[PDB]
Design a binder for these strands. Structure first.
Ligand SMILES: [Mn+2]
Lengths: 612, 161
DNA sequence: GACAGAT
């Protein structure tokens, strides 16, 4: 008799959290027919009536676009037909998880529906996918009453969730259409270009046979970054600048290496005259002294981008490997959601308690016990993007419990968490300025007064240096030796994975869960080879492709078209442009660009002939 | 104007040839030393100058310049920065000016921060070297106490990248 | 017989 309301969310953890918050701890949980999705049940009030609440979760996207059948043959059609005359349907993504069947079975008898998907464009698209899957199996509407509801929330807190249940709205078909247009555009461009390129180059060069040459709005600019770095390395002319350093004996057996204030000189004669002014000078002269007390800022809350960067730089793991390890840890319940851009802790986060769990590990037992005794430091204010809270440890772990690779990622995460809550590193910077003839020199050193977050993060520590001698203005110190050094300008090195992730984030290429895939994709297609130090060296295939694109159409590699097209698609979200016209207009623009690429493909051949 | 004009130019520090002063002048019926100066600042020194800088000044055997003289910049380069990154601030700015009186060429170096002369100072500008200027290893040493930028507007042709 | 990007 009591009406049942379905409460679909986007991930099992979020579904469980919201169910726990709303049910005040009276859940009844059981697994559905996927294993990866659970159904929680409780009882409550909706629209002033007693109803039953069925909380369920999808495991991400439910659908993905694909051509019907003929345009999946790669030989019966030519790619030019994939822009306007290729109908696209929506099939089920992750068929291993029977998402559509599970949703229909759960909705076998529901009356209302409240859709707790995350507040973003992809969330709205998945919202409408779930609605299309669940609506045809519901219990219909008795009269003019509403049936579909939407809940908007910014953070997973009791008050926020209760308020979101208090005020309900409707889904945004405009954002859904924007995401659908983006997906269709990406499919129709990537598939057409890939099938032209890989079917052209497999018929002319035998070395490239049985190899896939792919084009895309993201991986092509990602490769273009590395190829640009390679071009900059190749077009480098070293120089021969001279420096001038002098050693001064402060004590009988103490020698100080001074640094020239004029850092470099690129003229040999000028360097020689400056040395000539300072040869027969055996008495230095002190002029200035500084005792400034600076500080080193503690790190912000852990971001997915920063985690990938550190895993690539220090730990020595690839982006996809790090993401898989983080996902395993999150599933096992050791770290929180590893795909967030929030670097600011929630106002109700229980920092003092999460820190008390890491109070028995011998690696940092002393630091945490001292910190909790003398009080914690408020974490730095940062950016709150409305996504999940930053990656923080949620359960105690030991190297025996975890493996040899999941422990290293866990160890960095928990050491980062303590650093964000610890104090700042305060150090004393001392500089002494010397007059050797008509010239000036400086010697600088650092002394740590009170170490802070460096205790739990030893790699970001002020290096140990000998204290500079105490002296005041007017003291005379014997001069040891003055010499020049014939230095050379160092060419830049190949782009690293850490540097590449920053570049993609600036230009909006790839989301949190797409950045690891794009780096691995260009590596699996032999565009770039991963070298020692996580340096991405372009291959002869990658160089030919990017250089060929600049000759024909620059708008296929430039790291600006992705943001430019995304701005156009936001017009559909705000209602300023209809979904049909924008999609058709952009497709014709690229379709014209496709024809120029095909007609001018002879340009890339003249570069590919040298390599293969 | 014969002796009085020659003395006026000599005191002002402009050392110009007799042909140069008789040609660069305008309105022969009536002119004044200020008019000669105004019209001279806009003329290339290579066509009107006179030989004052001692010969072989770039040999290191001369360690002093006496009297005020006006010279013309040919090119300016920042010796503390690489050729590609000419605007780099990783090192303090040091300028190597090449200077001409019309016939002989000399090289001067910014020995202390000169705010007036910058990397965008056009070729042909005039600088007066007042006082005693010291030459070490054939390089003049410039400061703010011995250089005055008098301007100048001669055909630039500096163009760009 | 392969494709795009995204959760
Ligand atoms: Mn999201």
């Amino acid at each position: 008799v009591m009406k049942t309301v379905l409460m679909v969310a986007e991930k099992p953890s979020l579904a469980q959290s919201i169910a726990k918050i709303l049910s005040r701890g009276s859940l009844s949980s059981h697994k559905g027919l996927n294993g990866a999705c659970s159904v929680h049940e409780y009882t409550g009030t909706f629209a002033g009536q007693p109803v039953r609440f069925k909380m369920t979760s999808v495991c991400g996207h439910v659908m993905t676009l694909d051509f019907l059948g003929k345009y999946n043959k790669w030989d019966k059609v030519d790619p030019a037909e994939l822009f306007s005359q290729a109908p696209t349907e929506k099939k089920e993504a992750n068929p291993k998880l029977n998402m559509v069947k599970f949703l229909q079975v759960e909705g076998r008898g529901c009356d209302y529906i409240v859709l707790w998907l995350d507040c973003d464009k992809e969330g709205e698209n998945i919202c409408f996918e779930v609605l299309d899957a669940v609506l045809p199996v519901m219990n219909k509407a008795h009269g003019g009453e509403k049936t579909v509801f939407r809940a908007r929330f910014s953070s997973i807190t009791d008050t926020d969730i209760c308020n979101a249940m208090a005020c309900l709205g409707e889904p945004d078909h405009n954002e859904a259409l924007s995401v659908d247009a983006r997906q269709e555009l990406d499919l129709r461009i990537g598939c057409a270009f890939t099938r032209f390129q890989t079917k052209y180059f497999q018929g002319k060069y035998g070395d490239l046979d049985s190899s896939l040459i792919s084009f895309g709005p993201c991986q092509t600019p990602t490769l273009g970054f590395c190829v640009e770095r390679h071009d900059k390395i190749q077009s480098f002319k070293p120089e021969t600048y001279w420096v001038l350093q002098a050693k001064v004996n402060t004590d009988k057996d103490r020698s100080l290496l001074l640094d020239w204030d004029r850092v470099r000189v690129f003229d040999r004669e000028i360097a020689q005259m400056f040395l000539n002014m300072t040869k027969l000078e055996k008495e230095a002269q002190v002029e200035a002294t500084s005792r400034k007390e600076k500080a080193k800022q503690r790190p912000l809350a852990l971001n997915t981008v920063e985690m990938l960067r550190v895993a690539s730089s220090s730990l020595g793991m690839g982006p996809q490997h790090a993401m898989q390890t983080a996902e395993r840890l999150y599933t096992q319940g050791y770290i929180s959601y590893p795909r967030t851009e929030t670097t600011h802790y929630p106002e109700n986060f229980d920092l003092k308690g999460s820190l008390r769990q890491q109070a028995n590990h011998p690696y940092w037992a002393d630091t945490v016990k001292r910190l909790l005794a003398e009080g914690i430091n408020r974490p730095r204010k940062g950016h709150d993007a409305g996504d999940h809270p930053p990656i923080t440890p949620m359960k105690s772990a030991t190297e025996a419990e975890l493996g040899g690779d999941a422990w290293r990622l866990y160890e960095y995460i928990t050491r980062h968490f303590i650093a964000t809550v610890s104090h700042d590193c305060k150090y004393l910077q001392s500089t002494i300025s010397f007059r050797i003839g008509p010239e000036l020199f400086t010697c600088s050193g650092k002394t740590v007064l009170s170490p802070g977050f460096t205790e739990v993060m030893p790699w970001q520590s002020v290096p140990l240096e000998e204290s500079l001698p105490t002296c005041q203005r007017g003291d005379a110190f014997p001069v040891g030796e003055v010499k020049m050094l014939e230095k050379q300008t160092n060419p830049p090195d190949y782009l690293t994975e850490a540097e590449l992730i920053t570049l993609m984030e600036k230009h909006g290429i790839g989301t949190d869960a797409s950045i690891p895939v794009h780096i691995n994709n260009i590596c699996q297609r032999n565009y770039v080879t991963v070298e020692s130090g996580r340096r991405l060296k372009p291959t002869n295939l990658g160089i030919v492709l990017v250089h060929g694109y600049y000759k024909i159409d620059a708008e296929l590699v430039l790291p600006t078209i992705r943001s430019a097209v995304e701005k156009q698609l936001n017009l559909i979200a705000q209602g300023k442009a209809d979904y049909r016209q924008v999609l058709g207009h952009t497709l014709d623009v690229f379709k014209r660009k496709f024809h120029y690429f095909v007609d001018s493909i002879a340009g890339m051949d003249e570069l590919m002939e040298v390599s293969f | 104007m014969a002796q009085v004009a020659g003395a006026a130019l000599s005191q002002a520090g402009w050392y110009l040839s007799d042909e140069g002063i008789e040609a660069c002048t305008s309105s022969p019926d009536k002119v004044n030393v200020n008019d000669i100066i105004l019209i001279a600042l806009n003329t290339d020194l290579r066509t009107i100058g006179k030989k004052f800088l001692p010969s072989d000044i770039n040999s290191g055997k001369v360690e002093k310049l006496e009297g005020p003289c006006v010279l013309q910049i040919q090119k300016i380069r920042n010796v503390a920065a690489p050729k590609d990154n000419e605007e780099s601030q990783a090192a303090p700015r040091m300028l190597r000016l090449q200077m001409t009186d019309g016939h002989i060429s000399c090289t001067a170096v910014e020995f202390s921060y000169m705010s007036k002369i910058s990397l965008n100072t056009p070729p042909g500008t005039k600088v007066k070297l007042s006082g005693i200027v010291d030459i070490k290893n054939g390089f003049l040493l410039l400061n703010d106490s011995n250089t005055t930028v008098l301007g100048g507007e001669v055909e630039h042709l500096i163009e760009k990248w």
